[PDB]
Structure 1
Amino acid sequence: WKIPPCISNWKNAKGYTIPLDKRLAAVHINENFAKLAEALYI
């Protein structure tokens, strides 16, 4: 039941430094692209 704290990307009410890594953390391609592109080359 421990709740992580929030570090927002919009609000920094108290002006605190947070390292880039912890600041940071808080793609598909079909297989028919191949058939289309190669049909076009042919």
Structure 2
Amino acid sequence: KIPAAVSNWKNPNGYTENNTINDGFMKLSEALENADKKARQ
């Protein structure tokens, strides 16, 4: 059985992401926050 074609681009006259964060992102911001606190002290 073929479904009916309904287009997002054109209308006939008649009958009108899963993936989570990579851990390299987690570990980059931990390192940059330690270097920030260590530098400001």
User: How many pairs are equivalent?
Assistant: 31
Give the number of the structure whose alpha-carbon radius of gyration is greater.
Answer: 2
In the alignment, which residue of structure 2 is the partner of 1:22? Answer: none
- Greater relative CO (CA pairs within 8 A, separation 6+): 1
TM-score in terms of structure 2 length: 0.60
Give % identity.
55
Partners of 2:29 and 2:11 in 1: CA distance:
48
Unaligned runs of 5+ in 2: 35-41
TM-score in terms of structure 1 length: 0.59
Unaligned runs of 5+ in 1: 17-26
